[PDB]
Amino acid sequence: PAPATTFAHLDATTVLSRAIAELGIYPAVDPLDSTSRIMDPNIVGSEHYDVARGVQKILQDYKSLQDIIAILGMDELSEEDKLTVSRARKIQRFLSQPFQVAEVFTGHMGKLVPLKETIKGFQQILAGEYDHLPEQAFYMVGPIEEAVAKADKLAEEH
């Protein structure tokens, strides 16, 4: 009753999920459970709204495909399903961000990513511009340039 009663008193609720914190992703924000009252294309713009809705849709489709993965395994999906799963995992990693106040926990350095940098990065991961980069390059970085640089360094060392 206490959180359920608090929900109606807010304008932008951010819900932290333990299942996402167990994936190593931080902040543990639940992308399919957090809501804003200004997530309106007449307030933030059509590009930002479309990118956010596409991210949420691909994450919901990933949730749906995880069951078929559980029963059948990952080697039985249509190539478009594998593409959906790959892009969804990349979007999950890229949603994580290293915090300045978490340098003691993470070890990484903090990042403060502007709005248009975020929109551009997620728009490009949605369009498929990084289907060649590994998913572990988007984890715990800032903008998409850091993702490309981390992928380069990973390729060099590994």
Added chain:
Amino acid sequence: PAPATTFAHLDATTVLSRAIAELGIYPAVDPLDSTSRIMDPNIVGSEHYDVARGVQKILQDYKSLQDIIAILGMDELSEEDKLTVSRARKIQRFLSQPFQVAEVFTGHMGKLVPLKETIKGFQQILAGEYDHLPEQAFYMVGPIEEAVAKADKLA
């Protein structure tokens, strides 16, 4: 609240289970819910301790597999998983025993198994020395020699 409060007053707990009793295994002791404070290598010996801990390990592994075994059948496991299942089922059977107070309504004469014979039989089952006998041969016997006799009597 009553059994939960009683749990703290005991040195040994034998927890009987209805699910185990419906499998025909008697006594219905739950082997992963019964504890003792002298189950300690420095008290019962490293041999006893190792046999007990290995039995409990294989039973826990069987219990972990039970879900996949229930839905996807037995054939969707690996080779070591099937070996674990078979040994765990043999151990489940061999944990049962005919009592002398139960002779009246079972006909089977009761068995009083010495501790060393128990440790030896379970060490041997854990080793694999009886992976060729059927699991029904370990059900309601005393020592492991009665298990091999019952196996030779089935075939």
Added chain:
Amino acid sequence: GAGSIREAGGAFGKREQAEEERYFRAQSREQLAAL
């Protein structure tokens, strides 16, 4: 109830996670050597 097999954390969610991680670590090794 989409994604409820993995969400229950049973013997089927653990094997689902293992399958995803195996497949995508193989794919990451395949994608890093070609970079």
Added chain:
Amino acid sequence: KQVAGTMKLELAQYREVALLSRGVRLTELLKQGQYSPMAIEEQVAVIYAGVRGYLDKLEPSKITKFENAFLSHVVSQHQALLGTIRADGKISEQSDAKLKEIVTNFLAGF
């Protein structure tokens, strides 16, 4: 911290797919007896031996006993390195190489 950050990362990666042999090595290395609290230097030496690859040449079953023997050896003829780790708090690259060669020799003899 040096040994345990890497051990935590590798144990997480092992839990994700439960590499796998290093993960099993670390798991069987986390097991401990009762009423036997180890010193922090001996803990660091054991986690070093387990996280640097000196335990993947052994089967998971024997790991435990190796540890015992290892500790014995280290607490018999190598009190200097343990005292060094204890006083400095960190490992130095010199002492890193020292414990490296100690564990390499012991694994060769084990």
Added chain:
Amino acid sequence: KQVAGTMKLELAQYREVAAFAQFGSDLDAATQQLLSRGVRLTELLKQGQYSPMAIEEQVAVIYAGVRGYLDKLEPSKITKFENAFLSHVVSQHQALLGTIRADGKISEQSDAKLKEIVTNFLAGFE
């Protein structure tokens, strides 16, 4: 009534066979057609906030959806069609809209006019 009876039956069949999706490419033509018509109608029921439609425009859109003039189209395009088509029928076909709204039903003349409008628009649609 005319359009929604058919739409409801088709969506019920689609809900019956929806669990077979993500494998539907390996099933018979009847199941694949149920799945396709269902995805088209599901994309037809999406709507934007604070923009309610008149009943005759809803009737035109559902008519296009259930009579089969969207099966050849891609799902991701359906919305776009439903938008463009709407603007079209609002500008150059206000007479048929007024007729459907004033008579409350799709007469046979109105049915033929709807059929012609939708087939010509789809012929000239991108």
Added chain:
Amino acid sequence: VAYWRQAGLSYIRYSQICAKAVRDALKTEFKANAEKTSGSNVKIV
């Protein structure tokens, strides 16, 4: 001993070439189904 066997080939390769040649000469009404039905998909490890 034909010329291709002297060159080291086999009758499996001979058959493959001959069947592919017979398929290439099919009028396109049958060609797609013909190349689908007889196409190989197995890969060697």
Added chain:
Amino acid sequence: TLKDITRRLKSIKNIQKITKSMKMVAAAKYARAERELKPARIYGLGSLALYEKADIKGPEDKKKHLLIGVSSDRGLCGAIHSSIAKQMKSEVATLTAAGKEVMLVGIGDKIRGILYRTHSDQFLVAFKEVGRKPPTFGDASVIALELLNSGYEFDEGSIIFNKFRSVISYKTEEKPIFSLNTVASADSMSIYDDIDADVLQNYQEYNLANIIYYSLKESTTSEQSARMTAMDNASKNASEMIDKLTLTFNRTRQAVITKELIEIISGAAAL
């Protein structure tokens, strides 16, 4: 706990839906496999009519053996791959106990994955991507080339496949594969005119391809039937677990409502 039971209910309901869809898909694929098995069976059994009319008997003392096992890359079938692996292991044992040098071939990733831990010294080549698309004669031709372009001059061979009997029944069969020296040295072949070693070589190569094709077309049908029945059984078991867990869930929710009422009533009675 109510939330644990609800989690498990949702999980097993998803599993039941997926296994039902997989049973339908396996039925659709088995229909096509059993349709294509008729001309493939006529073909593959007419390829063997010679060795049954000429009564080729193979050698009893020859040394090298080639053992082929036909399976697929997909699981969830049942005892398909396990039957093939059991037959292959039994035959390898019985041959090596007679001194014969045995080399293994596995068509399909499952048989190689099963046998590669214990039988890997005795291994020649394996094949992947068997099961997704139905087998074609191009697949048999490729397998026959890589069995010929391998330098392993075998003396005798066997091929172990799952012969399809019915929707419920399949039997692990074994077919022999003769060398040039076996069909050339046979006394029953003296009645076949216009024959030299070259035509017999070509004939034996083509018949290798034919027997591989016939084995693939039998095994695909057997495997699709087995997968259909296995997914049917999985759906049955999932429905059983769903019913038991629904009973448990209703029990637990009634208990939770009663407990909350009792808490409220005892709080009100203490005033």
Added chain:
Amino acid sequence: QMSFTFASPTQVFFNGANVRQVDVPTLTGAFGILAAHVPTLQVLRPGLVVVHAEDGTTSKYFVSSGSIAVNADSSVQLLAEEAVTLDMLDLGAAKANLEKAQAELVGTADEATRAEIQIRIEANEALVKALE
């Protein structure tokens, strides 16, 4: 007396049929098989298979390769990897591919690659001669 089974990996043309004569293009020449023909076993080359029914009518096919077995019980087994009725082929594609194969032959300098080019050439030559 002749029981003739003619089959492709995906299609059966005859199955125990009673034909009276079959002409086959074996790699050691063409020959015609009637009942009681001497037992033989051969492998085929690309060419026409003309099956003669008991009632004078003939069926022409084009087979790419495969095997032929005439047995002591007058049972004939013809197994073609690619058997095709003559109405499914066109002359123009056969001629164009023959020209391409001749060009690639006059270009190639290897021995086994040249063997494969020659096989394709002779296959397309049989196609051209058979179509018209």
